[PDB]
Structure formats: C-alpha cells, structure tokens
Amino acid sequence: SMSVKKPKRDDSKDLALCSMILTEMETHEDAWPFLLPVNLKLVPGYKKVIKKPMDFSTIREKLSSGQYPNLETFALDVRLVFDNCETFNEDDSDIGRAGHNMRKYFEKKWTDTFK
C-alpha cells in the first residue's frame, strides 16, 4: 500500500532472458506452424473464429520495440499462440501435436529460468 512495499525483485535481466527463451522456441523443429501469422485470406474460418491471432514473429517484433511492460504480458502472448492452436486444430494432427509439444517446452524453460 502507500509507502509500504515488498522487497524489490531484480527484473533488469528479464528482457534478455525472454529473448533467449524466444530464440529457443524459434529454433525448435516443431515451431513451423507458429513462425508467421496465419494467412487470413487463405485459411477459411480463421479470421472469424480466432479473435486474437498471435505468432512468434509478432512476439519478436513486440519484444524488440518495448511493447511488453513486464515478463507476464510476454508469457500471455506465448500461451495465446498455443491456445489458438488448440482452438483450431485437432489434437491428433501434426499441427495439434506440435502445439502441445511447444507449450510443454516453453513451460519448462519458463519455470527453470524464473521460478
């Protein structure tokens, strides 16, 4: 509350560490469904059904240009990529399995780096 603060957590390396995690996600073999925005002219249903599209390139541009105020807003966009994938793709598809694998990979790096 006013003039009463918990001790200051060091957040000065967060930007660098989220960049490293994102590099690792970009270079995973199962990243291919997620590297670029889904083409809304060529994929029927996507525009109407997926209210907030997100992809790794879009996260990388936001990260590089100071559009994440803190590490939690970064994790929300990464998880959005996987939540959108589950909304649109069957679990038993290559893309559906890719998304489960990537979410697992991300969540371990997130815990090991910050928790």
UniProtKB/Swiss-Prot annotation:
The subunit structure is: Component of the BRF-1 ISWI chromatin remodeling complex, at least composed of SMARCA1 and BAZ2B, which regulates the spacing of histone octamers on the DNA template to facilitate access to DNA. Within the BRF-1 ISWI chromatin remodeling complex interacts with SMARCA1; the interaction is direct. Component of the BRF-5 ISWI chromatin remodeling complex, at least composed of SMARCA5/SNF2H and BAZ2B, which regulates the spacing of histone octamers on the DNA template to facilitate access to DNA.
Source organism per entry reads: Homo sapiens (Human)
**Where does the Bromo domain start and stop, copy by copy?**
9-113
Which gene name does the record give?
BAZ2B
Tell me what this protein is called.
Bromodomain adjacent to zinc finger domain protein 2B
Q: What does this protein do?
A: Regulatory subunit of the ATP-dependent BRF-1 and BRF-5 ISWI chromatin remodeling complexes, which form ordered nucleosome arrays on chromatin and facilitate access to DNA during DNA-templated processes such as DNA replication, transcription, and repair. Both complexes regulate the spacing of nucleosomes along the chromatin and have the ability to slide mononucleosomes to the center of a DNA template. The BRF-1 ISWI chromatin remodeling complex has a lower ATP hydrolysis rate than the BRF-5 ISWI chromatin remodeling complex.
Q: In which tissues is it expressed?
A: Expressed at varying levels in several tissues, whereas a smaller transcript was expressed specifically in testis.
Annotated family: Belongs to the WAL family.
Location(s) in or outside the cell: Nucleus
